[PDB]
Write a protein that binds this ligand. Structure first.
Ligand code: 6SU
Length: 291
């Protein structure tokens, strides 16, 4: 799957909030463009002159993630974070010259991402009480991956000492996206576990943190909550469910060609970190059938 690469696969079935450190530093920001940031300003002015109702927004930028030696005690992951914006994103990752910027970045900084906004997305493998994952159908009238299948998530907005506040706002925000879009009560939701981080190669390699959340409602109750919002309560145009049994082989189904890249990352990481049993019990041929 060339539109998704894994940057991080978390250990021990996935990492709780309490085992993650963030470092938020201007050292982690995008580098100024070779000819200067005037190019970003130009693209932005042109866009507002077509769509004057648009507004800019801060985003978290992923610089890198470092995993501790496996089976160690103490914090298991360090996320190195800076700040970007919607505007810097439109002017870099979504620019026509994004492939050229990545190459100038290798030359100048030995980093394909150095000239890119790279805002950090979040997504969820969201399981029901009756062992299904939740999927959403994207509007055919939005710009990014129109009419494709997606999982709940978003692009959180800002505001280990501030670092802990940052990690808390990342975990908080995956639950908040589930409450806003799927219309579920917060109290039906487990604390998220981080499964890993995936990169979208169709969007110049911008990264999404992928989480696992369990809901106490059955699929039938989740559908009722979703639909009871009405067309204005969600940006998606439908909801649907696949048995966890059937997620194992989803990359061999015709559904795979319809999944947007960040949802592909969420399913691959769910399969590697939450699926894939290590024990004799869940390893046994009758519980884990071959091929
Ligand atoms: C490039 O953007 C930043 O680093 C940054 C820092 C601080 C605040 C914001 N907010 S906004 C609404 O201007 O996009 C962006």
């Amino acid at each position: 799957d060339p539109e998704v690469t894994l940057l991080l696969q978390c250990p021990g079935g996935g990492l709780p909030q309490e085992q993650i450190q963030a470092e938020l530093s201007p050292a982690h920001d995008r580098r100024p463009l070779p000819g200067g940031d005037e190019a970003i300003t130009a693209i932005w002015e042109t866009r507002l002159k077509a769509q004057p109702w648009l507004f800019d927004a801060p985003k978290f930028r992923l610089h890198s993630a470092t995993l501790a030696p496996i089976g160690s005690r103490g914090p298991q992951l360090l996320l190195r974070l800076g700040l970007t914006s919607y505007r810097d994103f439109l002017g870099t990752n979504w620019s026509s010259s994004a492939a050229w910027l990545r190459q100038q970045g290798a030359t100048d900084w030995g980093d394909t991402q150095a000239y890119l906004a790279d805002p950090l997305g979040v997504g969820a493998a969201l399981a029901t009480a009756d062992d299904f994952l939740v999927f959403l159908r994207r509007s055919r009238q939005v710009a990014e991956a129109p009419g494709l299948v997606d999982v709940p998530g978003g692009h959180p907005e800002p505001q280990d000492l501030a670092g802990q506040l940052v990690v808390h706002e990342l975990f908080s925000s995956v639950l908040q996206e589930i409450c806003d879009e799927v219309n579920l009560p917060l109290l039906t939701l487990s604390q998220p576990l981080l499964l890993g981080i995936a990169r979208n190669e169709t969007s110049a390699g911008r990264a999404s943190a992928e989480f696992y959340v369990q809901c106490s409602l059955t699929s039938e109750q989740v559908r009722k909550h979703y639909l009871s919002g009405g067309p204005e309560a969600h940006e998606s145009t439908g909801i649907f469910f696949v048995e966890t049994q059937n997620v194992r082989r989803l990359p061999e189904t015709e559904m795979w060609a319809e999944l947007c890249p960040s949802a592909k990352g969420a399913i691959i990481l769910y399969n590697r970190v939450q699926g894939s049993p290590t024990g004799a019990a869940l390893g046994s041929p009758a519980l884990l059938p071959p091929l």
